């Protein structure tokens, strides 16, 4: 399955995933392409902030859905 992640710079990431992939797995794929650790990743979809231990189908994310990647500051 194919989904999109939109960054604050206006770039679009193109990921290959499955509906059973966790939000943790997705952040790991985003790290493969962008080199940003999941630490500093934060995903938004359908008004929700996506939790790491849930799957894409839990949030009913489907093909061609666009996720929003934003900052996750631990305050430094």
């Amino acid at each position: 399955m194919q989904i999109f992640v939109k960054t604050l710079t206006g770039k679009t990431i193109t990921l290959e995933v499955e509906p059973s992939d966790t939000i943790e797995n997705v952040k790991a794929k985003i790290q493969d392409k962008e080199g940003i650790p999941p630490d500093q990743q934060r995903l938004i979809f359908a008004g929700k902030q996506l939790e790491d231990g849930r799957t894409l189908s839990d949030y009913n994310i489907q093909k061609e859905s666009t996720l929003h990647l934003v900052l996750r500051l631990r305050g430094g």
């Binding site: 604050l8 934060r42 938004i44 979809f45 359908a46 008004g47 929700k48 902030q49 666009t66 929003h68 934003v70 900052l71 996750r72 500051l73 305050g75």
Partner: protein, 146 residues
């Protein structure tokens, strides 16, 4: 109202608002949760702001009740998250959509209406000392919106 709520929900699906998103929190269509990215122009940049949307039974005859859950420094938004926007009250139209309401709110963040404020002290700062307002607004974005 349920059919109207679904049509709107799907509509966002085909043409999704940039730097915005919304959905039912759970299984209740009447109660939605939404996010707004701090607008690039604004001092809210980089913050993610969460909002609640509750649709009245009489919707769309009556406007949705919208509030901030994330804390924000705004003349038109108070500590409890309540919003002073015309579209939510006097100027509501059944013709209007949540997407429009979210767009209106984003615009509000870029350009506040100080003359008809919800917090008088913030409006005073925005008016007489814009630098201080931009500087404080940034402090709160990092403090509460990151």
């Amino acid at each position: 109202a349920l059919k109207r709520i679904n049509k709107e929900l799907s509509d966002l699906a085909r043409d999704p608002p940039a730097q915005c998103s919304a959905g039912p929190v759970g299984d209740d269509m009447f109660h939605w949760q939404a996010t707004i990215m701090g607008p690039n122009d604004s001092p809210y940049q980089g913050g993610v702001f969460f909002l609640t949307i509750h649709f009245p039974t009489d919707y769309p005859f009556k406007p949705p009740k919208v509030a901030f859950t994330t804390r924000i420094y705004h003349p038109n938004i108070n500590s409890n998250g309540s919003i002073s926007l015309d579209i939510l009250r006097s100027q509501w139209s059944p013709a209007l959509t949540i997407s429009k309401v979210l767009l209106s709110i984003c615009s509000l963040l870029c350009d506040p209406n100080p003359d008809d404020p919800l917090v008088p002290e913030i409006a005073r700062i925005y008016k007489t000392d814009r630098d201080k307002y931009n500087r404080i607004s940034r402090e709160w974005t990092q403090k509460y919106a990151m």
